């Protein structure tokens, strides 16, 4: 199976797999059962922003999610990602719906990784920023139902022509180039990610959520990962 580290924006509480009884943000280390969660006052139909940060000295994966005019939600988990992830990874966004549904629209996405080595004022770095997506976005690997270009957005899950989100959908977008998160001469490794999202649902119970994830470079959507598994995991272990 894939190796997955993710920050989940979980819109639907599945209490039998350890979700709290409310929408929440969580840190997932190789399991959909988050190592840490925090309550998330999700807003149907409003544009939100998520930030993810980590560095190899502090070994703490942290995330913050907010909306304009509202307080934020934050979650952190102490973990050495070099003991979890391989040396080369791909980064991406994932989303799903199940019997309950929502739009999982990405309006922008940025990522920065830095490897600071032993040699004088070195730094290896990768940075990308999307503030709009075109219909043929060649530097994204789209998987499942994900599409780009509709209103210049990245639609991670299926939406009808009338704009209604569809259930039982799963889709991901990974940045085309592999990302180097560890090197033998590196003295500090760090990354940060930001994405803005629009989760819209005609229903009182939207599902299932959006995640920023880091994976083995050849990661693909696991079989049966619609719904609560967020397109990231093959089971709820
Ligand atoms: Ca859930
Ligand atoms: Mn959850």
Q: Could you tell me the distance, in angstroms and rounded to a whole number, from the CA of residue 11 to the centre of ligand 2?
A: 8
CA 95 – CA 104 distance, rounded (Å): 6
Q: Could you tell me the distance, in angstroms and rounded to a whole number, from the CA of residue 77 to the centre of ligand 2?
A: 15
Two tokens, residue 24? 């929440």
3-state SS, one letter per residue, for 156-183: CCCECCCCCECCCCEEEEEECCCEECCC
Please state, in angstroms and as integers, the Cα–Cα distance from residue 28 to each residue in 122, 131, 177, 183, following that order: 32, 26, 23, 24
Q: Could you tell me the distance, in angstroms and rounded to a whole number, from the CA of residue 11 to the centre of ligand 1?
A: 6
Do the beta carbons of residue 84 and residue 30 sit within 8 Å?
yes
Binding positions for Mn(2+)? 8, 10, 19, 24
CA 43 – CA 128 distance, rounded (Å): 27
What was the elucidation method?
X-ray
CA 71 – CA 159 distance, rounded (Å): 29
Q: For residue 38, give the ligand nearest its CA.
A: 2
Q: Could you tell me the distance, in angstroms and rounded to a whole number, from the CA of residue 33 to the centre of ligand 1?
A: 9
Q: Could you tell me the distance, in angstroms and rounded to a whole number, from the CA of residue 26 to the centre of ligand 2?
A: 6
Two tokens, residue 175? 């940045």
Total residues belonging to the chain: 237
Given resolution (angstroms): 1.9
Q: Return the CATH architecture of domain 1-237.
A: Sandwich (2.60)
Please state, in angstroms and as integers, the Cα–Cα distance from residue 59 to each residue in 53, 113, 132, following that order: 10, 15, 32
Q: Where are the domains of the chain?
A: 1-237
CA 61 – CA 84 distance, rounded (Å): 12
CA atoms within a 13 Å half-sphere pointing along the CA-CB vector of 68: 6
Place of tokens 């819109």: 11
Do the beta carbons of residue 148 and residue 140 sit within 8 Å?
yes
CA 50 – CA 72 distance, rounded (Å): 10
β-strand partners of 126: 113
3-state SS, one letter per residue, for the chain: CCCEEEEEEECCCCHHHCCCCCCEEEEEECCCCCCEEEECCCCCCCEEEEEEEEECCCCEEEEEEECCCCCCEEEEEECCHHHCCCCEEEEEEEEECCCCCCCCEEEEEEEEEEEEECCCCCCEEEEEEECCCCCCCCCEEEEECCEECHHHCEECCCECCCCCECCCCEEEEEECCCEECCCCCEEEEEEEEEEEEECCCCCCCCCCEEEEEEEECCCCCCCCCCHHHCCCCCCCC
């Amino acid at each position: 199976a894939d190796t997955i580290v993710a920050v989940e924006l979980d819109t639907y509480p599945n209490t039998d797999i350890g979700d709290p009884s409310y929408p929440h943000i969580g840190i997932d280390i190789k399991s959909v059962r988050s190592k840490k969660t925090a309550k998330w006052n999700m807003q149907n139909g409003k544009v939100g922003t998520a930030h993810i940060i980590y560095n190899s000295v502090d070994k703490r994966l942290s995330a913050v999610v907010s909306y304009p005019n509202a307080d934020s939600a934050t979650v952190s988990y102490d973990v050495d990602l070099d003991n979890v992830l391989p040396e080369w990874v791909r980064v991406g966004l994932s989303a799903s719906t199940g019997l309950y549904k929502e739009t999982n629209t990405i309006l922008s996405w940025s990522f920065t990784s830095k490897l600071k080595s032993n040699s004088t004022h070195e730094t290896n770095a990768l940075h990308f920023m999307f503030n709009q997506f075109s219909k043929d976005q060649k530097d994204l690997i789209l998987q499942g139902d994900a599409t780009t270009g509709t209103d210049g957005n990245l639609e991670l899950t299926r939406v009808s022509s009338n704009g209604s989100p569809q259930g039982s959908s799963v889709g991901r977008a990974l940045f085309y180039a592999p990302v180097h998160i560890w090197e033998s001469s590196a003295v500090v490794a760090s990354f940060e990610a930001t994405f803005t999202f629009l989760i819209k649902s005609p229903d009182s119970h939207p599902a299932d959520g959006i995640a920023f994830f880091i994976s083995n470079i050849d990661s693909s959507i696991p079989s049966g990962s619609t719904g609560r598994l967020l397109g990231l995991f093959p089971d709820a272990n």
